[PDB]
From a paper:
The side view for Δ2 is characterized by two distinct features within each MBP layer, whereas that of Δ5 shows three such features. These observations suggest a configuration in which the MBP and GS subunits of construct Δ2 are approximately aligned along the (6-fold) axial direction, such that adjacent rings of MBP and GS subunits stack with an eclipsed geometry. To obtain a higher resolution cryo-EM structure for MBP-GS construct Δ2 we collected a larger dataset, used an electron-counting direct detection camera and performed 3D classification. This led to a new reconstruction with an overall resolution of 4.2 Å (FSC = 0.143 criterion) and a local resolution that varied from ~4 Å within the GS subunit to between 6 and 10 Å within the MBP subunit. A good fit was also observed for MBP: the N- and C-terminal lobes enclosing the active site are clearly defined, several helical elements are well resolved, and the bound maltose ligand is partly visible. NMA confirmed that the MBP subunit within construct Δ2 is significantly more mobile than the GS scaffold: the predicted rms displacement of MBP residues is on average 4.5 times higher than for GS. Inspection of the junction region shows a continuous tube of density between the C-terminus of MBP and the N-terminus of GS, suggesting the formation of a single helix spanning these subunits. Strikingly, the observed position of the C-terminal MBP helix deviates significantly from that predicted by extending the N-terminal GS helix with ideal geometry. This deviation corresponds to a 60° rotation of the MBP subunit relative to the position expected if the junction formed an ideal helix. Distortion of the intersubunit helix relieves the steric overlap and permits favourable contacts between MBP and GS, which stabilize the MBP orientation and thereby extend the D6 symmetry from the scaffold to the target. For one construct (Δ2), the 12 MBP subunits within the particle adopt the same orientation relative to the GS subunits to which they are fused.
Numbering used by the authors:
A (entry chain L), B (entry chain G), C (entry chain A): 3 to 468
Amino acid sequence: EHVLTMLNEHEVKFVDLRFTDTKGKEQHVTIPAHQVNAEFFEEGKMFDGSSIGGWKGINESDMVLMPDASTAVIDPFFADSTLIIRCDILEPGTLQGYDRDPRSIAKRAEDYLRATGIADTVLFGPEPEFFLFDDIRFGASISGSHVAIDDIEGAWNSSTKYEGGNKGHRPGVKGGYFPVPPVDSAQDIRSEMCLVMEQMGLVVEAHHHEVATAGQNEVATRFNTMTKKADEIQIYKYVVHNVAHRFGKTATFMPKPMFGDNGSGMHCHMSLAKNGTNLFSGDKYAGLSEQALYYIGGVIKHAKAINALANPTTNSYKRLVPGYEAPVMLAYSARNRSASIRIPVVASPKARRIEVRFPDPAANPYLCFAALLMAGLDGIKNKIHPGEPMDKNLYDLPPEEAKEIPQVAGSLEEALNALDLDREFLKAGGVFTDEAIDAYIALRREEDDRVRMTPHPVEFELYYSV
Amino acid sequence: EHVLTMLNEHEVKFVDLRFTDTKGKEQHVTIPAHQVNAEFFEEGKMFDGSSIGGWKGINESDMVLMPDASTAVIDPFFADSTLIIRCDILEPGTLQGYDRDPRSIAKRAEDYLRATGIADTVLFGPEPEFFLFDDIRFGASISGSHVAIDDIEGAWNSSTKYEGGNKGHRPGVKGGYFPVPPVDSAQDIRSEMCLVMEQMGLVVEAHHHEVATAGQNEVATRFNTMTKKADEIQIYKYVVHNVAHRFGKTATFMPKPMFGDNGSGMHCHMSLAKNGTNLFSGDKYAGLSEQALYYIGGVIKHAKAINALANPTTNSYKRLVPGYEAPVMLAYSARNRSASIRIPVVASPKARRIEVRFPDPAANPYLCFAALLMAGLDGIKNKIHPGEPMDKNLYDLPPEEAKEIPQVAGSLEEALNALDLDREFLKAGGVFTDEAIDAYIALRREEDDRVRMTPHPVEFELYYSV
Amino acid sequence: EHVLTMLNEHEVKFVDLRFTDTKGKEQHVTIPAHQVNAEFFEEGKMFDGSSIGGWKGINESDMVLMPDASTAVIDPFFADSTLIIRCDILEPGTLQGYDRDPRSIAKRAEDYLRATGIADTVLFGPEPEFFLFDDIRFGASISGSHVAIDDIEGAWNSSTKYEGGNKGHRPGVKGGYFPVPPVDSAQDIRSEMCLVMEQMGLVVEAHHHEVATAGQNEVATRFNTMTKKADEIQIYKYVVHNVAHRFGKTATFMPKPMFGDNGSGMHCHMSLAKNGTNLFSGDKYAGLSEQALYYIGGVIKHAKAINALANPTTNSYKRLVPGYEAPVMLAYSARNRSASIRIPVVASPKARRIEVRFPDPAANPYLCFAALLMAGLDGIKNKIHPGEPMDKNLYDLPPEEAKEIPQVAGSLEEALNALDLDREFLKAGGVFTDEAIDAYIALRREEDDRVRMTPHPVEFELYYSV
């Protein structure tokens, strides 16, 4: 009913139905507002399943788009007044919730949480970073391939001739952390993104330029319950992509667009709760509950499999490389930023939580968050102890005992394989089905293949004169 | 009278008289509003027949334009207020309805339906798809020929240098199914098309980007009675073409503009009715009446001849090729999307119908719809049983029994020849005359010849070094 | 031994081993002269079969290259002295003669001729025509396709600006038949081709410019026994291609490179003989033997199947179109140049023969000639009477009885299908195996598909605004 009044209040002409595919990309279809009736909400609208990658095959194409009336929000970019309504994908007749629908999967995972009685709500606070460029060009054909990035902030443009003169105040390599404008050219744009994000229901905590030259930026938003947060991530990306477009830029959430400067990560802060109390505060290490520790143990035990969802691109592994600040060591600490799991030191026990650092923004919200949870729960159910916190150092020196302690997957294939083998913790509660998992893996292997099979420019530098 | 009041209400300065030629192209002529009087409606206006392709020859040029007052609608693009009035082409004196007038032919077919008493109204719900480009160039002369397509969405432009930078968020090949903007660059335009379509009497159900890269799009409209729907198709195309033009684009309803990506089809949903009840619902397969099955049998029996009207271009056959999703297998099913006849699975028996998938948007509304009907009726009158539904697979593997089951025509010539031989079902009720059919065939053979006789670029690749 | 002396006489450094693939394209591999020993001639050299299209598959790759010492001839273009030796492809161990080797097939056919005792030698006098251009450009990708032809003789260049001025004496469209230079710009080149052809063993009868503008030309060579003539065709093409290249031109034997002007044909004059007497001279029509007539009957009966070898490209059918001089009517005559079979009127009965006009230069020598023979023999063995000679007119007016008399295939697919069904006459004597035929058909269907599936530039002209 709230929806039917929003239609009149904003004189809506269209309703934009949205959903996410397996890869994590928001999709949409539009219907005139006059097509929204009572039926619409109880039985949804029909659409072809076979069209989305990794979904229904040759025989069972048709499926249901079920509008979730709680998600109604006005689109701030479209020319004609239109209302966005996120939808779940349900199996026809049964109206159950498609095994391969990432939002259904995430909901199932929140259900299973309540069911085990371990807690009643999961809290996710992801920190996606991104880049804002002016020009992005790439291609690949039989005779070669290339990628060219360009932005007014790129340090390389210190020598570029410009029509009205080079005004040259640019962030150097790894020198983007906070120079005030004009070095930072994105203040106005970061704020528009903030205002718009809030007009769309998100709550912004801060915004700032990130480390890399050439437009790395970040908008920090307040956490929320798992599934609602993944929804927020989708909106977040949408706002970022579109505000950038409107400003004459182009944004990307790729994890490592440039060799030699910062990649973009999506740290995930998590904590559990029951009847308003934070199940993660306690007397153990850094203010943690023993539940938190088991959770951590779970995440560490299933890290490589989580990688397949939290770092789902070959590019993801160009960020997760033996570097200093590389969040690749499977350990926890409240200081050592070598550890992929940081423990925020905060006063109020109400805010005690863990920060899993290896995820990147390419990750499917839904599936990434879900896999993080399930690993945590399995860590609890099986009281998987974390061991002791690493407070020493990262991957380089150490190099004492060859420092072969836990680490995240080193390639996408490896992560996919881990997901293959270590799938039980995900199938728990019937959240993830084998079919879903196998389909996801197949989609990504096809991507992994393109990169493995196509000659790399660097290979010419290294081997043309062989 | 309603017309004469619309003239005053909108301060109309002109009346744009419209009609369609044999090929399916809407035509027009304009007269000042002050030329609209009582006479106009009862006796129409005179015009030269010999000017339209495939119409009157050397001796009998003059014919009548009969305004159909029910079709009055304001043109939303012209600068000066003008009212559009669709017209039928009548033989002078007799005022009968020209044998070769596609609208008259379609009306005759609706009449014959009522006459046989099989039903009192036919329902058509076509789904024309189309492409929106930025640049289209082509030519052919003695020294060569070419065609060049270009659009900001084309995947090939991932490498193109642009004045203000390449913002690069483009739908990859076969990757247009629903990425939200900015990947989908046509939201605003699809909605203007919707709003305008509705201002012109159409009822829109949905709009979305289609599968192909480079601007394939679709506006779904509500079905209507056969002849009124063909009228709607013409308006639909008009709106699409002109809104595109106003937005700096160029739209085409060609069936296969690009090799390697989706073509554009025009699926046709059909059903019959009498005194408000759906003659297609029943206890037989998937909720069908035995009448529906005979109809299907008719369509299948006369498929190749229908092709000559539903796929009237050589280009049409570049879409209908042994592909996976190619709607080329003459069979029905509620799932197998290899079958050119899908049976929508819907709850309300009031909405039971069949979907003939092989038609393309190049088809003349009128003649295509009519041929579909006549084939259906002949399927009924002669209780032509469908056989059993194909629920196995498409054209490739199968490949067991060489899988030579029914198929649609494989070339325009073949389709024209089928139409030649299998014309009886069309002549039924005096709907289609031999002269009309022979004239249509002659028009298309001339087109078929251009393509058969002109060297193809690929022939050089294949045989220049022979 | 003659070969071993040619090696010393010309101080040969290399031996270029040549052969032809199924499509008809000459192939080669080179070995130092010092690799030529006694063994070489008796056991040949080994090579990978799987590399040539339509040959050995996954398991049986290796085959034998058997040098035919009778074919030794010096290459007139290579920089270092090299001797060309044509080779047959033999099955290893058995040393039989590969079923799919076109030269072996042609030899088998000459054998079968002698075996039936019908005659002891077959005489072939083909007349391949060709084009000489300056620039040829073409391509096809997802966004389009094109072909651009250019030559200093092209009539279209009457308006072109040239660096040193346009000297403008060019052959107009269809106006190339014999204007003396400078209109004819290829006298010097046609003669070099002649001299070189003769240095390579061919005997030249004449050379002249052909009908089409833009460099159509022809070098007429003396007939020879079937297999030796096909060898000559290969050499002929080689000389043409390479002399053109050396003169800064580019030659093509494609049958119809331009719409609107002459295509290139390869008329085939044939006759049979026994113990020096011409089995084709007689008292019947135009000086023919009844044997000749049965031969003609055979050719006419199996025309469509022969087409698959004599007109093996989709392009071939752009030459064979209802035109005036189009050699498409399956009939004979000594005058009517509408007839695909002309009977040369000559005095000496020693020179009596038939001229089958529909072949084009794209045809595989071997397979085309062989198919022509086998059809002729089957015409004899089964005394297939020709019927009466057509002396009336071609395809247009006539148009009396709709003039549906015999005609050659109208498309490649049709020809391939005919070859499929009408294969018996080819399998006779074990000359053609089913496997060979099926493989050939598969190679060409793949080619036919490219053309059928790729949008044609003309389709845009005809249907973009549909």
